[PDB]
Design a protein around this ligand. Structure first.
Ligand SMILES: Nc1ncnc2c1ncn2[C@@H]1O[C@H](COP(=O)(O)OP(=O)(O)O)[C@@H](O)[C@H]1O
Ligand SMILES: Nc1ncnc2c1ncn2[C@@H]1O[C@H](COP(=O)(O)OP(=O)(O)O)[C@@H](O)[C@H]1O
Length: 228
């Protein structure tokens, strides 16, 4: 069974621009897929629809057992605990330590504090930065910040991780390091969809490629080339 099932999705913004014009995409647990296409094709709109940051107008969309047409605002946090999200600009909170930035994504459950700490240390070890637990984001390189943000994204052990240009603000060396981390997370079973403009990454680390142009899927292929 699918972990993401999108059918005939249409999205028109308030000013009238139709950003998705009938997109259908099916993703199985454990897949790694790149989302590629020219500026304005609708990649960001597609990614945002997967964690309900944008609401679809027509079609259907299910993610991790959540019906994103039906889900109420009050339940989006629950969805966010099954879908981790990674951003091009990392979006750490600059006044919080590394520990606080990661712990913030874990829901408080009565006590929870000691359990939260063990899990924060687990994901820090997964990304190789346990020695930064008390650091602030400014003390970290861009690559280190994105590794911390990825630790935050997986802190609830989600089955899906969505990334919008996760290496777009990183230089080449750090871009490859972040790809290695994402691939390691994927090999453990997590489904990963990531939008990207990095032709060298897509052409080298071959995965499923979903190409969008003018709001429609034009190509969907195993181990595909970047094609742009
Ligand atoms: N015409 C547009 N084309 C592309 N992106 C847009 C457009 N209008 C708004 N945006 C996006 O939305 C952001 C601003 O959101 P906006 O609709 O102005 O809401 P608000 O001002 O209430 O926060 C922009 O930074 C951009 O990312
Ligand atoms: N908030 C917005 N309001 C109006 N138009 C928008 C908004 N955000 C994006 N668009 C437009 O919708 C289309 C798709 O944008 P986007 O999903 O960001 O594409 P991509 O990520 O492929 O560059 C573009 O024409 C863009 O200008």
């Amino acid at each position: 069974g699918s972990i993401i099932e999108m059918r005939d999705v249409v999205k028109k913004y308030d000013n009238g621009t139709t950003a998705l014009r009938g997109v259908s995409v099916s993703v199985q647990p454990g897949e790694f897929a790149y989302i590629v296409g020219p500026s304005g094709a609708g990649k960001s709109t597609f990614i945002r629809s997967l964690y309900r940051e944008v609401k679809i107008d027509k079609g259907s969309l299910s993610v991790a057992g959540f019906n994103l047409v039906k889900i109420k605002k009050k339940d989006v946090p629950l969805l966010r605990r099954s879908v981790g999200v990674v951003f091009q600009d990392y979006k750490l909170l600059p006044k919080k330590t590394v520990y606080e930035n990661i712990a913030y994504a874990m829901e408080v459950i009565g006590e929870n504090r000691r359990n939260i700490k063990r899990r924060v240390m687990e994901v820090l070890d997964l990304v190789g930065l346990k020695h930064k637990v008390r650091s602030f984001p400014n003390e970290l390189s861009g690559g280190e910040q994105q590794r911390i943000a990825i630790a935050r994204a997986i802190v609830n052990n989600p089955k899906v991780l969505i990334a919008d240009e996760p290496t777009g603000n990183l230089d080449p060396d750090n871009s490859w390091e972040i790809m290695n981390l994402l691939e390691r997370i994927n090999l453990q079973g997590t489904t990963i969809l990531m939008a990207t403009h990095n032709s060298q990454i897509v052409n080298t680390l071959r995965h499923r490629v979903i190409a969008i142009e003018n709001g429609r899927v034009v190509r969907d292929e195993s181990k595909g080339e970047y094609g742009y």
